[PDB]
Each structure stands twice: as C-alpha cells, then as structure tokens.
C-alpha cells in the first residue's frame, strides 16, 4: 500500500478543471476547496477527504470548523493550516474574497495543514 501521492499528481489537471464544472454546475454561489497534507509538516495521516465545498457567504472560521469535525480532534489536540505551504493559522477572511486571492490554475482554494507549527 503506497498511499503517497497528492490530488496533484493522482489527478491530471484537466481532470480537477472538469471537477469545478459540476461544483459551479450544482453550487453556483457556493466555493471549492483543496487541501491536502502539507510536506514540511508531514504528522497527520491522509485525511477523510481531499476536496471539499464552502458556502461564500462563510469566513475562514467556519472552514476550519468544518476540518476539525474533518478529522478526529479539536483546538487542544492540534489545528494548523496555511496555504501554498508558506502561510500561518489566521481565521476571519470570508471565504468569497479569500478564495479569489487563494484560487489555483484548476479553480480551487489549495491549502495544507499540520499538527505543529514548526520548521523543517
């Protein structure tokens, strides 16, 4: 059992771009979002899911919220995400706007996340 492979480089671009065609298809006022491990904190295990929805009338909050029930802990355990591997934990950006700022050549909010926040 291998199980070391990314969205990335399991699914081909063009096929994460036909994924955002049925996200926008069923959910036009909703916001897509990939986050996977993040490779200078490889702790966590895969988690549940890899791809996951958001409704744009949300806020950073509300999205980690959902990655604590996500996975099996809360605040006391560990919780830390960044995105493009280079961010720190901030909550309280709406969703709406920080997609559009965070988006990716496919269209989905790429972000990682950590049970630390130490260097490598």
Known sequence: MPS???F???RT???RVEDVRLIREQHPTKIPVII???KGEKQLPVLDKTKFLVPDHVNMSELIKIIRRRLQLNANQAFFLLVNGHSMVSVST???EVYESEK???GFLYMVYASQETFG
Do not use: A, L, V
């Open 104 to 106: 990716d050549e496919d």
């Open 13 to 15: 671009f063009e096929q």
């Open 94 to 96: 709406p969703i709406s």
């Open 36 to 38: 996977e491990r993040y």
């Open 8 to 10: 990335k480089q399991r």
């Open 4 to 6: 070391e492979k990314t």
